[PDB]
Amino acid sequence: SVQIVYKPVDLSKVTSKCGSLGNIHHKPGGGQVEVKSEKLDFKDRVQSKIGSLDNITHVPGGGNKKIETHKLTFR
Amino acid sequence: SVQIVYKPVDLSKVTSKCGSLGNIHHKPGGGQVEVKSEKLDFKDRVQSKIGSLDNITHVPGGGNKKIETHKLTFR
Amino acid sequence: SVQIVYKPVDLSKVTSKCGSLGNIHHKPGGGQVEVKSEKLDFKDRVQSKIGSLDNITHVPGGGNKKIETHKLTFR
Amino acid sequence: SVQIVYKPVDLSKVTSKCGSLGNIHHKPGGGQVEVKSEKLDFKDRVQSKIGSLDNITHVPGGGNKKIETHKLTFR
Amino acid sequence: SVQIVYKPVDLSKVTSKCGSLGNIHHKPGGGQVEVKSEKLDFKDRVQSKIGSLDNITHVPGGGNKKIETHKLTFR
Amino acid sequence: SVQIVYKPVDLSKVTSKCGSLGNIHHKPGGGQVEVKSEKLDFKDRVQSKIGSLDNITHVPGGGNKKIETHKLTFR
């Protein structure tokens, strides 16, 4: 016979405290961008991106992450 | 016979404290960018990116991470 | 007695010839401009200019100048 | 008695010839400009210029100058 | 008695010939410019210039100069 | 008695010939410029210039100069 008892006990705290969060500045791509092309040949697919793309400013007041995984596998 | 008892006990604290968080400046790509192309041949796929792309400013007030994994595997 | 004879003779030619004049590009001030000011005191006059000012593109097809001065002064 | 005879004779030619004039590019101030000021005191006049100012592109097809001065002074 | 005879004779030619004039590039101030100031005191006049100012691109197809001065002074 | 005869004779030619004039590049101030100032005192006049100023690109197709001076002075 088989007796399996799973008792994870968790009283944990991922925590933060901040008095003031501010005066943040993200300025990507302030310079000038110039692209000149003459006489090109493409025989397959083309992807182009030109300018200021996919810039992120992420300012979470908290920003706490807790990841927990439980696997109980029985053969 | 088999007796298995799993008792993880956790009272942990991942924690932070900050009086003031600020005066942060991210300025990518302030200079000028110039691209000139003449007489190119491509016979396969092409990917191009030109300018200021995928710049991140990440200012979490807290920013605490806790990762916990439990595996109980029985054959 | 006094005899004064002034005979300037001029058959001159300031001249130009141009087959094609073109494909000219003047781009001042393509970059980004940022001005932040806190807690200033001025006790006299102030002049400020901010941005793209007084840029000239001057493309005279001819552009020929002839300056001629005659002074005949008699005491 | 006084005899004065002024005979300047001029058959001169300031001249130019150009087949094609072109493909000119003036790009001043492509970069980013940033000015931060805190706690200044001025007790007299102030002049400020910030950015892209007084840039000239001058493409005269001809551009020939002739300057001629005649002074006949008699005491 | 006084006889003065002024006979300048000029059949001169300041001249140029150019088949093609082109593919010229003037790019001043492509880099980024940053100016930070704290706690300054001025008790007299101030002049400031910041950025890309007074840049010249001068492409005269001809560009020939002739300067001629005649002075006949009589005491 | 006084006889003065002035006969300058000039059949001179300042001349040029150029098949192609081109592919010229003037790029001043490509690098980044940074100026930080704290706690300065000025008791007299101030002049400041910061960045890319007074750069010249001068490409005269001809560019020939002739300077001629005649002085006939009589006491």
Author numbering:
A (entry chain F), B (entry chain B), C (entry chain E), D (entry chain A), E (entry chain C), F (entry chain D): 305 to 379
Give verbatim lines from the article.
The ordered cores of the filaments span residues K274-R379 of three-repeat tau and S305-R379 of four-repeat tau.
Three types of filaments were observed that were made of two identical protofilaments arranged in different ways. Types I-III of CTE filaments were present in the frontal cortex, with only Types I and II being found in the temporal cortex. By cryo-EM, the tau fold was identical to that in CTE, SSPE and ALS/PDC. This is the first inherited tauopathy with the CTE fold.
